[PDB]
Design a protein around this ligand. Sequence first.
Ligand SMILES: [Ca+2]
Ligand SMILES: [Ca+2]
Lengths: 440, 445
Amino acid sequence: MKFSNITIKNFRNFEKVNINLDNKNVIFGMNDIGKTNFLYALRFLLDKEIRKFGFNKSDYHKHDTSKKIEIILTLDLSNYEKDEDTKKLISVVKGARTSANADVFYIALESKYDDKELYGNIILKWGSELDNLIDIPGRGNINALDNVFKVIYINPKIVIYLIEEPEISLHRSMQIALSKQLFEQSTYKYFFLSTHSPELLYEMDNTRLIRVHSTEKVVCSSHMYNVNKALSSALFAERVLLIEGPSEKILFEKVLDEVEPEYELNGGFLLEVGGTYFNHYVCTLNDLGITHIIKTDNDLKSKKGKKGVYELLGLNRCLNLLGRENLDEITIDIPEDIKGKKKKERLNERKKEIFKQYKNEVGEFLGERIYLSEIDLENDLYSAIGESMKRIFENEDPVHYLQKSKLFNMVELVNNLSTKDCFDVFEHEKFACLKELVGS
Amino acid sequence: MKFSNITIKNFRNFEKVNINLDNKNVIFGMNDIGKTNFLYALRFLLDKEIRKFGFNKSDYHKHDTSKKIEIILTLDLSNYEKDEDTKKLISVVKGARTSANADVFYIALESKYDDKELYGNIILKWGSELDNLIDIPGRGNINALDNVFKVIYINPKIVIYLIEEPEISLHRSMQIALSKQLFEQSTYKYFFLSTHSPELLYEMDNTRLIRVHSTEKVVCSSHMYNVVKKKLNKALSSALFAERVLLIEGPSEKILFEKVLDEVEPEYELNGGFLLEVGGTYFNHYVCTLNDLGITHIIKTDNDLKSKKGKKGVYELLGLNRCLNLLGRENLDEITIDIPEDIKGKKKKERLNERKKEIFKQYKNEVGEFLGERIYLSEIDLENDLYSAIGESMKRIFENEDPVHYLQKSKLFNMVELVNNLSTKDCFDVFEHEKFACLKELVGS
DNA sequence: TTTAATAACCCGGTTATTTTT
DNA sequence: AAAAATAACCGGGTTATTAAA
Ligand SMILES: [Ca+2]
Ligand SMILES: [Ca+2]
């Protein structure tokens, strides 16, 4: 009884599309024209108050020719034993089943000859096979299809809901209450929800994501959702850059609005993880067709029980994202001396030798969407705008000046930064994580 | 020059309001009718196409009487320097400025005889003194106020912008870009902004915040706000749209408290309640803004101990000293806890956990004016006065003899496991206790 | 013979004490 | 007589080795 797919041929934006469905469907995307045409395709198939006006000239493909519109719904009916809705659809259809063991049923909408009397005319045919479809019998204004289904449309009998953007002029907690009410109540068994707000999509289970695109053909991507608050604003994006901390984010929001400031309208997003852990995020983004991009920094860690033996932490966190094996450990000797500045200067010079030692493995990290820095953000930020960093802080060592307060000295660099400097950050050879987010 | 105040007297919701407002005014609250009526009071004061129809019967306070509606605006006139609006405002007037050393200017709005042929007969007067105001002169349909000020209204010469709900049919990143165009650049200098959106208040500085109260007296709280302001305003921007705010340190007591405030009072966000994450024990960054806007700043803390850097065995008293730093008082002295080297771990944790009760029952006089104000201090942490409420049900779920040791290892991963299997009576058990009296003051019961 | 309990590191904050110049 | 590390806690996360019953 759970709906298999819909085939739309010659409608107002479509040429040949086959959108897989189930119950509880969510439609999003960039263009609103394809989302309105998807819900009006369901309204022309299953609602009589749109279907009684017929088709206009604008309801065909573009505005002229290809004068044969099919909208076909395929239900995947099968045997659900004594069921409330399935035995109802056995009971009203009756004689249009060609066999008693058929596990599929078709509802087809045909339209032809727009050019004669300026009128579309819509013919609805039942049938469990693609050949020998039987016409739906009706006496007056009422078909026998209208005894089965009922369509309720929301915009600011098996019941189908069609909801278009309920986030307009409501509070966000009312969107959270609508988000729980769409998935715990059994009266919202079948819907098609069009939305932009992330608060309607916090809790979500067993849901076909239908993504429409900005192309003129409009192709649709259809994905199953089975089982989070950070991912809800990243559900509406195709490309997600996964970054570690807020100091990365303030720099990237200053660069990405001074180079290409409409990146999130095109479908890019900046996602925080709050640490160095990406494997809980990339399995969620991989199942939903969202292209993750990972930016992380190379780190070293001292080993417990051994003095001088250091383990390769930032390399192994990219090897565990690929399912690979860990590396063997290194040995650094460090004297007593002072451990404030000089110990960090030994540990930078070891990590550069590591980063040139495993450069062909950095290459197969970068063949996937994992980008690993040489040391940190603050040291390859110094490799681009290091002539501009000494003027702002009035200091000889600006990396050590950012090392004291990582975010508070970052926002003083952000608040005094020129327009040409963001191109120098963005066009660097080591800031290539940004170039895969914008898609250029 | 800058705006100084408006005084609205007998208009359609107000009885006597003296609203002190600077430039770049931001208007918010749960009274959308009062925000709409405040912008209509500015349109009857300063716009031509609203004032040419006059007052109807509906904007005579409630529906009747109130026979003298006075709307008086003061702009105080004394900045000059490179801004020529002082020179325009003193060049258009002739005899309203009687003395050239005066530092106040009055634009007054009057109306009378409300029951004569259903017309307001709006009269506009100028003057630098409150007594003997002169009449604003005009020839035909155009006053002398009309040649000075121009009003542009947005709803989906000296320029005044009146913007009403711009988040309708506007995308979220363009709301953030509209906040950046409102407050960083100098394009809009005089505006009044009404909104319901948290993302128009991210980048804001040097602005007057007007909070409209939910009561029927429609009084307002106006705050001069000057300032990492992104890290402050990202948390604070959804908290300003809330009348009462609970300040919590961690995401364990968002997951714990949102289950309880959906089982007991699930419409608590619709009456002016909010839960504010801090991410640590730093509440002095957040209480400076909420107290000046009339928002109650409710705070739940835990007692903490720290070993000192130089001496061994003595303990800095960080549980009470973070609560006195909001109250500005002098810090406490030092205590001595004798812990040997071969005790470390669970025994060391319970040996410090006894001494956090021993410092708390000693200092019950000191915590009386903590809880008399909106600062709440726990016994040890969240998970022992949570065990003093639902502790028979803590041992049911984890299949553990001592579940508070089982919960400190995990934090969120067994806090979520606790919150998913909570019964209905359990969320009234935890809401009722006197150590969870911070939850009552958020909802007022 | 498994099993929890810290060393080590990452993403943010504070406040008093050495420390070095 | 300062100002810059450095303990030592607070809100979150992951491996890996050790002590531990
Ligand atoms: Ca890093
Ligand atoms: Ca705590």
